[PDB]
Design a protein around this ligand. Structure first.
Ligand SMILES: CCCCCCCCCCCCCCCCCC(=O)OC[C@H](COP(=O)([O-])OCC[N+](C)(C)C)OC(=O)CCCCCCCCCCCCCCCCC
Ligand SMILES: CCCCCCCCCCCCCCCCCC(=O)OC[C@H](COP(=O)([O-])OCC[N+](C)(C)C)OC(=O)CCCCCCCCCCCCCCCCC
Ligand SMILES: CCCCCCCCCCCCCCCCCC(=O)OC[C@H](COP(=O)([O-])OCC[N+](C)(C)C)OC(=O)CCCCCCCCCCCCCCCCC
Ligand SMILES: CCCCCCCCCCCCCCCCCC(=O)OC[C@H](COP(=O)(O)OCCN)OC(=O)CCCCCCCCCCCCCCCCC
Ligand SMILES: CCCCCCCCCCCCCCCCCC(=O)OC[C@H](COP(=O)(O)OCCN)OC(=O)CCCCCCCCCCCCCCCCC
Ligand SMILES: CCCCCCCCCCCCCCCCCC(=O)OC[C@H](COP(=O)(O)OCCN)OC(=O)CCCCCCCCCCCCCCCCC
Ligand SMILES: CCCCCCCCCCC1=C(C)C(=O)C(OC)=C(OC)C1=O
Ligand code: SF4
Ligand code: SF4
Ligand code: SF4
Lengths: 176, 110, 312, 156, 43
């Protein structure tokens, strides 16, 4: 249930002594190292051609956030603030009021993408699949406040990526 | 004469490249840099071992200077004497190395 | 006309040093299961040009130098000695055909440590000075076995003439009578140019130089690398020379020197670094005793075989 | 004019050489260092873009702040930043370098590295992937590509 | 049910020991090739 690494007492017959001395004087293990490096010289490398080739992702991937809509145009967020109670970073700021037809809807849905730890507790705490953490990861900005999303930016990410987000949720929701 | 021209050409090319390296990026009007090391301000401690390997180099390089006429010395007619003195010089270099060994001279830079 | 010959020596040296950096990054890339540079040029061929233009317009690092004069002279001396190590090299005819080209190269390579030493003292860092003293002691250490191995091999040549060293090897490569001298020579020239696994300047001296002069030190070091591979090629792997077609020798020694420079690139992507005492142990307690023993063997061996080479 | 064409072509030349030979000094602060080590790994391979792996901080061209900046190391970050030769750029990698992140309300964390150094590219994630960091590096290259140093010098 | 499971016979065997294949000549043969190269060079 255990083994002894490096507890080999070497042989002292003239065969093994001359083998070790030929290894010392003729550099056998150094040529073994050169052979392994030469072996990787003639291998096809593992380099994908980014941006033209992309690294493989799964439908569970947790990237850029997006507020979704029902298949009628109505937004799914019913202002229940579970995503900001569960948020380990307190990145989500929510303020709500009844809108002009009496629906429980948010007026403030902020996510600070520089507080966010991208762990997806908001999409798994959301009872109506409103906030999701979509598949976009290429959204680097040049300014800090461009990573401070309001409700307009998140609903635009939903409208921008819904054709992908709905298919990822369709592929994954029986594991959830 | 060709060699002096070659040395002057190589020195002139090197000085031209060094002048371009020290004066072309000086024309950048970037910014004045305000307030331009493992030891802070302590003096350099003298290492006896660095001086020992330098003097060992110097003495063995002198023994090399004695060994340098050997491709010409193999052409002699007094070959027994020449062979004896050549093996004696390389043997005295080896005795210098063995004495440098056994009196702990090759230590911590072995 | 001779000035044209000096230009056709020294400008292609600079071009081959420029593209050796690309070959290093590519060969180290593919040996590391990745690619080297292939975006900046077609197959990466514009990467050294882009990098040289980048370094020559980067801000000068502006150090407080101890001596201004030696801070200027250390790149000058490094580049001048890096270029003058090529002029006795027979390929198949040298620029300066001299009777003592071997000893000339050993002398001008012995002078190369002053650039390291002056760059180390001309910086105000004591750490850079300690690193320079380590690098100088390393280089002057391995120059000992350079001199003695080189003498022992030239006991089969008859002279210090580099052009005679091609005539010496018309029946056999000189690595076949002298492969232990060849392998200790090869590791010793690997330790001359501060090259891995002997690169303790990268393991935790010219760090106070700006991007221009540091690039000049870097290109002088790679000129020394290409030159010592060419000198090892002429010294142990002497090609066939037809006097009516010299380009046969030129193509042949070029292929052998490229393989040997790639062998430097292939060593540096294969081994970890020595500790400083470990390569001091490698010189003084392993390479130098065998070097002295083989020097005795190659003194006494042309006498016991009646194979003393001609003086002329 | 003619000189406007000359400063346009020279801006194209020097911006080409500066974006095609970026040398990064990566602050290996925290978990984002692991993903920078994947952006240097064979799949993504920064070196094929001319982006070398671990240049020294005095010859590097861009400082990748990859991890959490604490109060104890913020003067060391500013020291390494001040010791960089110009043009120097700052990529902020990950949420802690961007805006404090998961340690934003901590007593010992600088709330974003932009309180300390001027930041060019903010790379979001915890950690942002090696592909996302490579996206940020290529966006930095595009930012260098549209620099007008000599055109504004000619128009001043 | 439908769930990520191993197949009906399980998977195949997975190697996990050191495999350093012991290539090269003996030390006697390596010094023999070296001394023979020396003798051919000397002749
Ligand atoms: C320790 C001594 C080692 C070397 C011993 C002499 C080797 C030799 O062949 O000497 C002949 C050589 C030369 O003799 P030779 O045989 O070459 O003489 C022929 C004449 N010439 C030189 C013109 C070609 O030296 C001598 O004969 C005298 C000098 C050395 C004598 C011994 C000194 C010992 C000192 C001990 C203290
Ligand atoms: C042979 C190997 C390669 C050699 C080097 C590469 C070849 C090209 C060399 C010339 C490149 C252009 C000049 C150097 C780069 C200048 C970049 C720069 O910082 O510009 C802003 C600088 C300064 O612009 P500035 O006045 O706006 O200053 C910026 C800094 N502030 C605002 C904070 C003060 O421009 C220059 O210095 C212009 C110098 C002349 C440019 C060329 C003229 C025509 C030459 C033909
Ligand atoms: C010119 C073309 C290339 C030439 C060949 C070189 C290419 C191969 C390069 C491989 C990569 C090397 C990377 C750097 C490695 C540095 C470390 C290293 O190797 O250290 C050397 C090692 C150092 O020893 P060590 O550290 O391995 O061993 C331990 C040593 N002690 C106990 C002291 C701690 O070995 C040597 O020094 C050997 C040098 C060459 C020996 C040549 C012997 C020839 C045979 C003579 C005859 C023998 C039989 C007896 C007499 C018979 C008479 C008939
Ligand atoms: C001894 C031999 C030594 C050899 C050393 C050099 C080896 C490599 C040689 C070069 C190989 C090919 C290089 C091609 C580079 C890429 C050129 C290119 O495509 O540039 C495009 C760019 C923009 O053009 P644009 O009109 O906008 O394109 C839109 C099209 N609808 O347009 C531009 O950028 C403008 C044009 C720039 C052209 C630069 C060409 C490269 C110069 C390199 C220097 C060496 C020259 C060769 C020396 C040896 C041969 C004499
Ligand atoms: C700090 C200062 C600046 C530092 C940077 C620059 C200096 C350092 C780098 C350059 C070093 C220059 C070395 C000059 C002499 C080299 C030795 C030499 O000339 O050997 C070659 C040759 C001997 O071969 P041989 O075949 O015998 O001669 C032809 C006749 N058959 O001999 C000949 O062919 C002889 C030819 C005629 C005599 C030539 C004399 C040259 C000028 C004097 C030396 C120049 C260097 C002075 C400064 C050195 C500083 C280290
Ligand atoms: C009077 C008017 C003229 C004034 C003086 C200027 C003289 C000519 C100077 C060189 C040419 C200037 C134009 C530079 C390129 C402009 C166009 C450009 O940026 O093209 C981009 C293209 C690559 O596109 P990229 O954005 O990199 O895309 C990523 C991959 N999809 O880029 C490419 O395809 C490669 C671009 C290569 C640039 C030219 C080659 C390098 C410079 C060679 C000459 C200078 C250096 C000489 C030798 C120095 C020492 C070795
Ligand atoms: C004008 C002739 C060329 C001048 C020298 C500049 C180009 C060669 C050195 C540049 C360089 C390259 C390419 C390089 O790849 C590199 O990284 C390993 C360096 O830093 C250690 C360099 O200095
Ligand atoms: S996004 Fe979901 S969890 Fe958050 S307030 Fe809206 S409905 Fe509730
Ligand atoms: S992924 Fe996590 S840290 Fe980010 S908003 Fe959702 S719950 Fe908050
Ligand atoms: S942003 Fe997150 S994952 Fe990245 S270094 Fe910070 S704590 Fe680690």
């Amino acid at each position: 249930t255990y083994k002894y690494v490096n507890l080999r007492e070497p042989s002292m017959d003239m065969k093994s002594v001359t083998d070790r001395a030929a290894q010392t004087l003729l550099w056998t293990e150094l040529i073994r190292g050169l052979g392994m490096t030469l072996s990787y010289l003639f291998r096809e490398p593992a380099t994908i051609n980014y941006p033209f080739e992309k690294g493989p992702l799964s439908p569970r991937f947790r990237g850029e956030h997006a507020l979704r809509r029902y298949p009628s145009g109505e937004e799914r967020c019913i202002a229940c603030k579970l995503c900001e109670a569960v948020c380990p970073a307190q990145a989500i700021t929510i303020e709500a009021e009844p809108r002009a037809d009496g629906s429980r809807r948010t007026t403030r849905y902020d996510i600070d993408m520089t507080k966010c730890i991208y762990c997806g507790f908001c999409q798994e705490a959301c009872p109506v699949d409103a906030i999701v953490e979509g598949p976009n990861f290429e959204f680097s900005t040049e300014t800090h406040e461009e990573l401070l999303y309001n409700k307009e930016k998140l609903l635009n990410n939903g409208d921008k990526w819904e054709a992908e987000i709905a298919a990822n949720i369709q592929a994954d929701y029986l594991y959830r | 004469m060709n060699l002096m021209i070659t040395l002057l050409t190589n020195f002139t090319l090197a000085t031209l490249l060094v002048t371009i390296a020290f004066w072309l990026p000086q024309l950048n009007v970037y910014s004045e840099k305000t307030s331009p090391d493992p030891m802070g301000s302590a003096r350099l401690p003298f290492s006896m071992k660095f001086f020992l390997v330098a003097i060992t180099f110097l003495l063995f390089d002198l023994e090399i200077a004695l060994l340098l006429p050997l491709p010409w010395a193999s052409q002699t007619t007094n070959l027994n004497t020449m062979l004896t003195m050549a093996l004696l010089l390389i043997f005295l270099l080896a005795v210098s190395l063995a004495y440098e060994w056994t009196q702990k001279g090759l230590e911590w830079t072995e | 006309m001779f000035m044209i010959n000096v230009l056709t020596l020294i400008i292609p040296i600079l071009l081959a040093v420029a593209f050796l950096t690309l070959v290093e990054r590519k060969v180290l890339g593919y040996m590391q299961f990745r690619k080297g540079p292939n975006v900046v040029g077609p197959y990466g061929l514009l990467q050294p040009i882009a990098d040289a233009i980048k370094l020559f317009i980067k801000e000068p690092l502006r150090p407080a130098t101890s001596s201004i004069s030696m801070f200027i002279l250390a790149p000058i001396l490094a580049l001048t000695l890096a270029l003058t190590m090529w002029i006795p090299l027979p390929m198949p005819y040298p620029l300066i055909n001299m009777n003592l080209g071997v000893l000339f190269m050993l002398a001008m390579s012995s002078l190369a440590v002053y650039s390291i030493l002056w760059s180390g003292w001309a910086s105000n860092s004591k750490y850079a000075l300690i690193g320079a003293l380590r690098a100088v002691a390393q280089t002057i250490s391995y120059e000992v076995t350079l001199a003695i191995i080189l003498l022992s091999v030239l006991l089969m040549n008859g002279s210090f003439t580099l052009s005679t060293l091609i005539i010496t090897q018309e029946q056999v490569w000189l690595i076949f009578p002298a492969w232990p001298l060849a392998m200790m020579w090869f590791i010793s020239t690997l330790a001359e140019t501060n090259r891995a696994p002997f690169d303790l300047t990268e393991g935790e001296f010219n760090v106070e130089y700006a991007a221009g002069p540091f690039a000049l030190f870097f290109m002088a070091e790679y000129a020394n690398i290409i030159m010592m591979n060419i000198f090892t090629t002429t010294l142990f792997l002497g090609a066939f020379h037809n006097p009516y077609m010299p380009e046969l020798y030129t193509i042949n020694f070029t292929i052998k020197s490229l393989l040997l420079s790639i062998t430097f690139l292939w060593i540096r992507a294969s081994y970890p670094r020595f500790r400083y005492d470990q390569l001091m142990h490698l010189l003084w307690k392993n390479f130098l005793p065998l070097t002295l023993a083989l020097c005795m063997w190659h003194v006494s061996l042309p006498i016991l075989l009646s194979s003393i080479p001609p003086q002329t | 004019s003619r000189g406007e064409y000359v400063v346009a072509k020279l801006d194209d030349l020097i911006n080409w050489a500066r974006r095609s030979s970026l040398w990064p000094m990566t602050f290996g602060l925290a978990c984002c260092a692991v993903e920078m080590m994947h952006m240097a790994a064979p799949r993504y391979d920064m070196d094929r873009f001319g982006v070398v792996f671990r240049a020294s901080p005095r010859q590097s061209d861009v400082m990748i702040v990859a991890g959490t900046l604490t109060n104890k190391m913020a003067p060391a970050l500013r020291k390494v930043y001040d010791q960089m030769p110009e043009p120097r750029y700052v990529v902020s990698m990950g949420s802690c370098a961007n805006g404090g992140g998961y340690y934003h309300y901590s007593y010992s964390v600088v709330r974003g590295c932009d309180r300390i150094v001027p930041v060019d590219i903010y790379v979001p994630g915890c950690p942002p992937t090696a592909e996302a960091l490579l996206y940020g590096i290529l966006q930095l290259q595009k930012k260098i590509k549209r620099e007008k140093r000599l055109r504004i010098w000619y128009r001043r | 049910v439908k769930q990520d499971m191993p197949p009906v016979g399980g998977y195949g065997p997975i190697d996990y020991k050191r495999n350093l294949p012991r290539r090269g000549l003996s030390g006697y043969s390596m010094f023999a090739v070296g001394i023979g190269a020396l003798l051919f060079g000397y002749w």
